[PDB]
Amino acid sequence: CSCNDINDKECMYFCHQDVIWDEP
């Protein structure tokens, strides 16, 4: 997962989700 510009709640959400995307 990659988060820095975004918040922790959203970060962890898709972190265990493993969103290998960038543009949805």
UniProtKB/Swiss-Prot annotation:
Which residues bear the site annotation Endothelin-receptor binding site? 21
- Detail the disulphide connectivity of this chain as listed in its UniProt entry: 1-15, 3-11
Function text: Vasoconstrictor activity. Causes cardiac arrest probably as a result of coronary vasospasm. Displays low agonistic activities towards endothelin-2 receptor (EDNRB) (displays affinity in the micromolar range).
Protein name (Swiss-Prot/TrEMBL): Sarafotoxin-m
Species of origin: Atractaspis microlepidota microlepidota
